[PDB]
A paper describes a structure:
Here we report that [name], like [name] (Schimpl et al., 2010), possesses activity toward synthetic glycopeptides derived from validated O-[name] sites in the human proteome, namely p53 (Ser149 [Yang et al., 2006]), TAK1-binding protein 1 (TAB1, Ser395 [Schimpl et al., 2010]), and [name] itself (Ser405 [Lazarus et al., 2006]). To investigate the molecular basis of this substrate specificity, we exploited the catalytic acid mutant of [name], [name], which is inactive yet unaffected in its ability to bind substrate (Rao et al., 2006). We generated an alternative [name] crystal form with a highly accessible active site and determined the structures of [name] [name] in complex with the p53-, TAB1-, and [name]-derived O-[name] peptides. The O-[name] sugar occupies the same position in all three structures (maximum atomic shift of 0.2 Å). Strikingly, the backbones of all three glycopeptides run in the same direction, together defining the −4 through +3 subsites, and adopt similar conformations near the O-[name] site (maximum Cα shift of 1.8 Å for the −2 to +1 subsites). Hydrophobic stacking of the solvent-exposed Tyr189 (Tyr69 in [name]) aromatic side chain with the −1 and −2 peptide bonds contributes a major amount (∼30% of the buried surface) of the interaction between the enzyme and the peptide component of the glycopeptides. All three glycopeptides adopt a “V-shaped” conformation that allows the sugar to penetrate the [name] active site. Interestingly, for two of the peptides, this conformation appears to be stabilized by intramolecular hydrogen bonds. The [name]-derived glycopeptide forms a hydrogen bond between the histidine in the −1 subsite and the backbone carbonyl oxygen of the O-[name] serine. For the p53-derived glycopeptide, a hydrogen bond is observed between the aspartic acid in the −1 subsite and the threonine in the +1 subsite. Such intramolecular interactions may stabilize the [name]-bound conformation of these glycopeptides, explaining the significantly lower Kms compared to the TAB1-derived peptide.
Numbering used by the authors:
A (entry chain A): 40 to 618
B (entry chain T): 402 to 407
The structure:
């Protein structure tokens, strides 16, 4: 009897209909001449990797896999689905059935067939597969990542790895817009050199391979001219640039106005509409144009319930078919409650797109953002149909947060941030998952102390125990059971971090090594802090002064190190104990 | 230059 393994995203409808079976060492593959070319390739790679040959001639003693779209006429597929259908599902949806030695995948479309294979890939462990009936489809139609942060852009290998990762987690969107790419912004008029164009072609190809919509962004708002011959020429620079990417296979475009001095709302929107008509519509196979206005968070967009000048004019002018993005109530913010999306969706008379600034850390680079999607309302799909996160300049560790973004945007109403966070680490880290949880748990909250605040609080259960300890002490209750419990946690933090330093692969380790060192330091300082509490209780001056110096030494190291972690928990505990 | 906002 075989269990349903960790899946991501959570499929909408899944039932276990049997004990499971082992897939034979050779399979009958059926329907692959007509089935989506990218789905079949994904399936082929997986089979090759897990040592499963494909039969050349049908063999009834071996597992049979049937794959295809609704719109392929393949009856042997409908037979194996057994009354289950993908016909009535939304675009990108699929049906999957494994029972009695047969696996059937039917996509609503090709995107759907590819995603069906991704779920198949997740269900198989050591050749064993549960027997299940699945119908599955996304809540949000556009799901993915906007590479739009400041600082060192992702590398070519970073992006290729990310794209394979998106496909595997059913994220279908990747927006290329790095602030510090000179040709994206600072020098938006200039053509990419030939070798950079070759790297582009590679990313486009890989995107198509993984069903990801590569969105080419451009940010001309610094110095674009709007009127007369200059406006013509500048407009034609957008066309030329977008054309050269179209000609390599790009079918999505974004034009961004964020973080600029010029606030000509009407002219911004006019550029959009013109590009929408002379480019997006003319081409006819190009997806809806994406944008961000110069006012892009509720605070900057709205004043006493009514839109500000720029926003009101921009909403009035911008074409209805154009996707408009906003960051929520602030630039980096705790929540997007339903009522915020309702307000903004109302001003724009449309479904909105989110540019969610988590896990991005360009505003506070000492900390890793390693928590789940948090504070985003689970009914958000009522006003939002396009969801993307802005990641860190650290591609590898961004995967933890993105994993949870895949789940939240695919199956929104079922989303449980703690379960999704745990699953992300479990799926990504393997043997090291438990220890990574211990570390990452202290690194989920982003707070620059002023305008930027978001994410699940740092290790809340520990903070609760710490708070509880100060209560037991100031009301002189017997604290000794909690003190042993707490020595264990501090020991554990140190044990786990030492294990990660020793065993994490380079690709993860070179992103978090300074923060590991930081949490070990703080754990050691928490330990001395308890020694301080215990020695004060035991009226032992020798032990108290010795522990105190050690506690201050650890805090001094953390205060002056670039790495920042557990500010309000592991760090604060030491500060609290020195009073 | 290095990040958004203030
Ligand atoms: C402003 O905020 C984030 C965080 O600094 C930054 O990465 C991004 O490029 C800016 N734009 C938007 C639309 O949030």
């Amino acid at each position: 009897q075989v269990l349903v393994p960790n899946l991501n995203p959570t499929p909408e409808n899944l039932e276990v209909v049997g004990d499971g079976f082992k897939i034979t060492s050779s399979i009958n593959l059926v329907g692959e001449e007509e089935a989506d070319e990218n789905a079949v390739n994904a399936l082929r790679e997986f089979l090759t990797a897990n040592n499963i040959e494909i039969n050349s001639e049908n063999d009834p003693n071996s597992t049979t896999l049937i794959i295809g779209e609704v719109d392929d006429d393949i009856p042997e597929l409908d037979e194996a689905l057994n009354g289950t259908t993908a016909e009535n599902l939304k675009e990108e949806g699929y049906a999957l059935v494994s029972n009695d030695g047969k696996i059937a995948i039917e996509g609503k479309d090709g995107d759907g067939t590819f995603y069906g294979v991704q779920t198949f890939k997740q269900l198989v462990k050591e050749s064993n597969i549960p027997e299940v009936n699945i119908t599955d489809y996304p809540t949000v139609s556009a799901r993915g990542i906007v590479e739009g942060f400041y600082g060192t852009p992702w590398t070519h290998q970073d992006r290729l790895d990310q794209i394979k990762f998106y496909g595997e987690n059913k994220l279908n969107t990747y927006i290329y817009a790095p602030k510090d790419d000179p040709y994206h912004r600072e020098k938006w008029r200039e053509p990419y050199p030939e070798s950079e164009m070759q790297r582009m072609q590679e990313l486009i190809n890989a995107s198509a391979e993984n069903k990801v919509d590569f969105v080419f962004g451009i940010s001309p708002g610094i110095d674009i001219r709007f009127d007369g011959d200059a406006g013509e020429e500048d407009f034609n620079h957008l066309i030329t640039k977008a054309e050269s990417l179209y000609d390599m296979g790009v079918r999505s475009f974004a034009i961004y106005w964020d973080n600029i001095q010029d606030k000509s709302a009407a002219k911004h929107a006019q550029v959009l509409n013109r590009f929408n008509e002379e480019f997006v519509k003319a081409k006819g196979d190009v997806k809806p144009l994406i944008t961000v206005p110069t006012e892009y968070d509720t605070g900057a967009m709205v004043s006493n319930g009514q839109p500000r000048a720029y926003t009101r004019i921009f909403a009035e002018t911008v074409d209805p078919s154009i996707e408009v993005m906003w960051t929520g109530p602030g630039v980096v913010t705790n929540e997007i409650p339903l009522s915020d999306a309702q307000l903004i969706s109302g001003i724009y008379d449309r479904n909105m797109a989110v540019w969610w600034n988590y896990p991005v850390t360009d505003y506070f680079k000492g900390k890793l953002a390693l928590g789940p999607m948090h504070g985003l309302d689970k009914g958000l799909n009522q006003y939002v149909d396009f969801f993307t996160v802005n990641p860190m300049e650290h591609a590898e560790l961004s995967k933890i947060s993105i994993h949870t973004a895949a789940d939240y945007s695919w199956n929104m109403d079922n989303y449980d941030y703690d379960k999704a966070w745990n699953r992300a680490i479990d799926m990504l880290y393997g043997d090291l998952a438990e220890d990574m949880k211990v570390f990452a748990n202290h690194s989920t909250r982003m707070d620059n102390k002023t305008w930027a605040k978001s994410g699940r609080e740092d290790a809340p259960e520990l903070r609760a125990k710490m708070d509880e300890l100060w209560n037991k002490l100031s009301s002189k209750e017997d604290a000794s059971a909690l003190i042993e419990e707490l020595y264990g946690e501090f020991a554990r933090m140190e044990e786990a971090c030492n294990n990660l330093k020793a065993n994490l692969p380079e690709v993860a380790l070179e992103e978090c090594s300074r923060q590991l060192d930081e949490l070990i330091t703080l754990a050691q300082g928490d330990k001395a802090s308890l020694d301080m509490i215990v020695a004060q209780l035991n009226e032992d001056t020798e032990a108290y002064e010795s522990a105190k110096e050690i506690a201050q030494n650890k805090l001094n190291t953390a205060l002056s190190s670039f790495a920042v972690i557990s500010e309000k928990v592991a760090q604060s505990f030491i500060q609290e104990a020195l009073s | 230059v290095a990040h958004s906002g203030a």
